[PDB]
Amino acid sequence: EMEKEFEQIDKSGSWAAIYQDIRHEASDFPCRVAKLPKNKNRNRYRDVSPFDHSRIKLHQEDNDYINASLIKMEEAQRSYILTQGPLPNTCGHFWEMVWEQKSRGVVMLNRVMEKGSLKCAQYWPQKEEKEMIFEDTNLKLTLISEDIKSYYTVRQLELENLTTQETREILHFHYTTWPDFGVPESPASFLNFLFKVRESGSLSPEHGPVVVHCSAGIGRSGTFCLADTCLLLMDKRKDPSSVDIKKVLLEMRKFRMGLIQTADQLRFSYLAVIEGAKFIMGDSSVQDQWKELSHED
């Protein structure tokens, strides 16, 4: 029982210990391709790399490397692609990945600039009249519309494969108030955002895996995915007590290193899941409440 465990950890204030225990037990697989000299400029962080076994391969003979991992949650039956914020030279690769993997949604949990630094390249058009063309991957990206809320923006984009001229609508979910190595304002604002992504159908199994990223693609992104998977597990069995949050995080860490970067992000994951469980078990009204408490208007 997560709610009981939560109260127990909070009482003894031992979140740091619990979190470090997960780190100690976390899987360790090679990241040789990511460490190849030719890919040095394709990585934003020297200490954050995708494992070779779960890395996303670009469909090109030249260089198929991109700092992105496929987190395939067998039991939950849902997959996510976690990646770093695209660099000025990997935006073409980023969209190539979105196209090849047939993703319908992209979840961004960081701002382009945080604490005075550029944590992510401006990989999407900010104005309808100024579309983007990635010559290296022969793709065109156009902003179709955007719905701006107080702490998050949802954009509708049109991605076109210039080679075949095929077109696809990509939904962009941009959470703009989640601090690096931080946590959301409240479980309410986080769940409100998560359900926005869910209600878009971007997580449907008929689409490719949703792409999730922050700056490094493990802290904030890890928190997002853990919460979602836990709620999904719980939902499939309609049994909140059947989910072991720590166990699921460890499973996720088999696919990408360092998912969830601080003990508080872990603690926030519990909070989010516990609160989200209310909706899963039939309390439809809580959704309206989260929307109100989030102050998105």
Ligand SMILES: O=C(O)COc1c(Br)csc1C(=O)O
């Ligand atoms: O997402 C997070 O909470 C932390 O991710 C980050 C990691 Br790993 C290294 S730097 C960095 C950042 O956001 O600058």
